[PDB]
Swiss-Prot record, chain A:
GO MF annotations, alphabetized: 5S rRNA binding; RNA binding; structural constituent of ribosome; tRNA binding
Family of the protein in this entry: Belongs to the universal ribosomal protein uL5 family.
The protein, known as: Large ribosomal subunit protein uL5
Pfam families linked: Ribosomal_L5 (PF00281), Ribosomal_L5_C (PF00673)
Assembly and interaction partners: Part of the 50S ribosomal subunit; part of the 5S rRNA/L5/L18/L25 subcomplex. Contacts the 5S rRNA; cross-links to the P site tRNA. Forms a bridge to the 30S subunit in the 70S ribosome, contacting protein S13 and S19.
Coiled coil: none
Further details from the record: Identified as a multicopy suppressor of the slow growth phenotype of an rsgA (yjeQ) deletion mutant.
Lipoprotein found in the keyword field: no
Annotated positions of the N6-acetyllysine modification: K2
Function: This is one of the proteins that bind and probably mediate the attachment of the 5S RNA into the large ribosomal subunit, where it forms part of the central protuberance. Its 5S rRNA binding is significantly enhanced in the presence of L18. In the 70S ribosome in the initiation state was modeled to contact protein S13 of the 30S subunit (bridge B1b), connecting the 2 subunits; the protein-protein contacts between S13 and L5 in B1b change in the model with bound EF-G implicating this bridge in subunit movement. In the two 3.5 A resolved ribosome structures the contacts between L5, S13 and S19 are different, confirming the dynamic nature of this interaction.
HAMAP family for the chain: Ribosomal_uL5_B (MF_01333_B)
PANTHER family given in the database record: 60S RIBOSOMAL PROTEIN L11-RELATED
Curated annotation (Swiss-Prot), chain B:
KW Zinc (keyword) present: yes
NCBIfam families: L31, PRK00019.1, PRK00528.1
PTM statement from Swiss-Prot or TrEMBL: Proteolytically cleaved by protease VII to yield a peptide lacking residues 63-70. It is not clear if this is due to protein degradation or is a bona fide processing event in the strain used in PubMed:339950 and PubMed:10556732. In strains B, D10, MRE-600 and Q13 the only protein seen in PubMed:10556732 was full-length; the last 7 amino acids were sequenced only for strain MRE-600.
Pfam family, one: Ribosomal_L31
Protein residues bound to Zn(2+): C16
Cofactor(s) the record lists: Zn(2+)
Subunit and partners: Part of the 50S ribosomal subunit.
Gene: rpmE
Protein name in UniProt: Large ribosomal subunit protein bL31
Source species of the chain: Escherichia coli (strain K12)
Entry's Gene Ontology cellular component terms: cytoplasm; cytosol; cytosolic large ribosomal subunit
GO terms for biological process, alphabetical: cytoplasmic translation; negative regulation of cytoplasmic translational initiation; translation; translational initiation
Length: 178, 70
RNA sequence: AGGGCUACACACGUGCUACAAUGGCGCAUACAAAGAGAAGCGACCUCGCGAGAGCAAGCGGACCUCAUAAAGUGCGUCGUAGUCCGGAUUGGAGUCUGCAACUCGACUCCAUGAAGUCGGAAUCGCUAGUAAUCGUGGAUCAGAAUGCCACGGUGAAUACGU
RNA sequence: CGCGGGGUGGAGCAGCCUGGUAGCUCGUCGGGCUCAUAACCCGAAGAUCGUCGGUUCAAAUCCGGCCCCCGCAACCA
RNA sequence: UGCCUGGCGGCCGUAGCGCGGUGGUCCCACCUGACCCCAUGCCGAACUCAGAAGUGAAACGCCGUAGCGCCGAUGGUAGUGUGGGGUCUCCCCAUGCGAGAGUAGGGAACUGCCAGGCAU
RNA sequence: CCGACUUACCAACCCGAUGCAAACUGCGAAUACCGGAGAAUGUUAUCACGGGAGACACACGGCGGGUGCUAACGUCCGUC
RNA sequence: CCUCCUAAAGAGUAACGGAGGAGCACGAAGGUUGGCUAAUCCUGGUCGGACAUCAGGAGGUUAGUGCAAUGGCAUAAGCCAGCUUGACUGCGAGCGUGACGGCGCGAGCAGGUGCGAAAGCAGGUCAUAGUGAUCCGGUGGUUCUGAAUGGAAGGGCCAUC
């Protein structure tokens, strides 16, 4: 995982020293990147479910855990235990390797989106990147029956607070949105 | 490490760098927080004349009458 | 001055282009009349896929030019398949006329490419150079015709009977 | 009971035995007729053939069961 | 005998919570690597496996702390058996029983078991 | 149209106080109830199974409470 | 017929008293093993409102529970995945219980079975509801009888409509 080798070799000392920390798991350490993707229900025949499956497929090769509408209450309606969003809690060291393009030069894709700010990660250092447009692997075809917009990417952190959050996400590199 | 899903993940070795080491990133303005114009450069060539006609090697000083050619 | 006159959901009157195999597709090939033109029409030249571009004779009009009629013919070609018709739409590039082509232009061009497979009830025009069809030219016109006006090709069916 | 018979575009009717097709009429919404209106004529729209399943190029139709009605069934100590 | 971690406890909010401070080969976590058992409605994060260094940070023991939760007297007080009265579904009086809440105040825990380190 | 320099203005969560309950409890007597050990008294009362029944139409009164107008020489139950 | 109260701290308790429901659903919604933890509000967010999903936090059961209500629960009883069919037959110590009919509950025995390394478990469903006495007839089993004898009907016994 070269981003995480960059963090092991270069960033851990940069961050440790500059923030004056005393122990290695006191120091910042970027954890468990997760995603969602929320579908406009699954549709009457489960076709927007297929659309969850190929979009996940775009940046995790797996299958979805697939989250279910536990309660269903107001306006999206019914079933109260049928499939909805598309979560992946990614693999470890490999997930950190994914992190080599997974929110670094994910930029030729980006057109703006509501996340990625060095002010509006939560007051707990936890954040969600809703990307819209798929990263690109280099293989054949670009007819995926596309679901144009997808993927809230919820990065998780050894972070409890504002200061560990902007340790990450900003000057760990890649930069936040300017 | 469950050995039975996830079929690819890494195989180019993640080459991207500038424009030039497979695919693009360019400048320090690599945060791409806007859309696509699809309409600027080369018509806007760095200049504001939008296709004057085919090249002459004369290009005289002032004025004319086209159907008299005198 | 800028919008609007030109909107668009929809219904109606008129003309357009076609639905094909008498045909459509390519090359080659033949014979029109009538017109308009000085601040206009504008060859030949050399470029340009094309529109056009630029250089410039010439014209003052049976002289030059707009301007090469086209369909038709001749051979190849497609083989009834919404196509090799039709090409509207729509993207991009391009030419152009002009204070200015976005609302709202004309035109080239490349790509893509829909409806239409003879059309209820109803309904119009037509007897002869007429009908049908092919193309030409001009007035309005800075530019901007599918229409208007006129021009000529090829050129018919039939009206028994009131 | 057992038997028979029915279960059609909003509504009311066509197709039914080797079957081939969703028809007709009202009601709709637009057209046509006449100087205009009236009615008249007309185009279009409007369905799983109550349900499931078996077959042929063919099931609205023929077969069982489901589900739903209805006629008869002088049947239940 | 003492100090400390851990397993198994007794008892099971005076035991808990917050708050603030402390500790690392003794053990315990996190912890790195997952090849192989095994495992993820997907995910070595979890479960599981191989294991040092890092590290006491987070976790967890420990220590201080009454903010909180909690326990909580004494007295009085309502209610009540029975027995007697005035009357109304209302109390007094006899004598027994006598709360709940609040108050003073207590209160951050005592305790058995084997093992392991350390002190001795 | 976003949002906020800008609170001038509203009532939710929350906070403090205060009251209420048949079908409310983080709390709880008296008494009644079960079983146990012992003292006393009690013509064994009680307890088994047999002969014989009458009975199942009760009201005011204290005590507790439903209905009712905390009406009824009401009504229905519990207790005495 | 079921749940609360009246109903007086055992519990039975009455009224055209007060308030709600049931007349099944069940082939996993049962068993067993193995695992796992809610409502709710807030902080941030691809479009959903922060009020369908996501991560985090606060919360600490206020959710869940096939179907009222009451009790229940975190060993979950709830949520899930495998294997599985103890929704076992014969019995049944002892009892709460009802005038009776009758209803309920149960360790263990014996057999045969499934899960589990295993101790262990399971004789349905977390509990209380989901029903119908006898007669007659009906189908099935039977090592029971089967009017002179042998067989048969018929009847008995058992299973079930």
């Amino acid at each position: 995982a070269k981003l995480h080798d960059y963090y092991k070799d270069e960033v851990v000392k940069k961050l440790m020293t500059e923030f004056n920390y005393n122990s290695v798991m006191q120091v910042p350490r970027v954890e468990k990147i997760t995603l969602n993707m929320g579908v406009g229900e699954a549709i009457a025949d489960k076709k927007l479910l297929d659309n969850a499956a190929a979009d996940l497929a775009a940046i995790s090769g797996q299958k979805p855990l697939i989250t279910k509408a536990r309660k269903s209450v107001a306006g999206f309606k019914i079933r109260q235990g049928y499939p909805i969003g598309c979560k992946v809690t990614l693999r470890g060291e490999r997930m950190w390797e994914f992190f080599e393009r997974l929110i670094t030069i994910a930029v030729p894709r980006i057109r703006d989106f509501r996340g990625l700010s060095a002010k509006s990660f939560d007051g707990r250092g936890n954040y969600s990147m809703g990307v819209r447009e798929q990263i690109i692997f280099p293989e054949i075809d670009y007819d995926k029956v596309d679901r144009v917009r997808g993927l809230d990417i919820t990065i998780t952190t050894t972070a409890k607070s504002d200061e560990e959050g902007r340790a990450l996400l900003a000057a760990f590199d890649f930069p936040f949105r300017k | 490490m469950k050995k039975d899903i996830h079929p690819k993940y890494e195989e180019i070795t993640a080459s991207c760098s500038c424009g030039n080491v497979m695919k693009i990133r360019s400048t320090v303005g690599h945060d791409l927080n806007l859309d696509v114009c699809s309409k600027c450069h080369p018509f806007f060539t760095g200049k504001q004349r939008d296709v004057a006609t085919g090249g002459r090697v004369d290009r005289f000083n002032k004025r004319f009458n086209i159907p008299g050619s005198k």
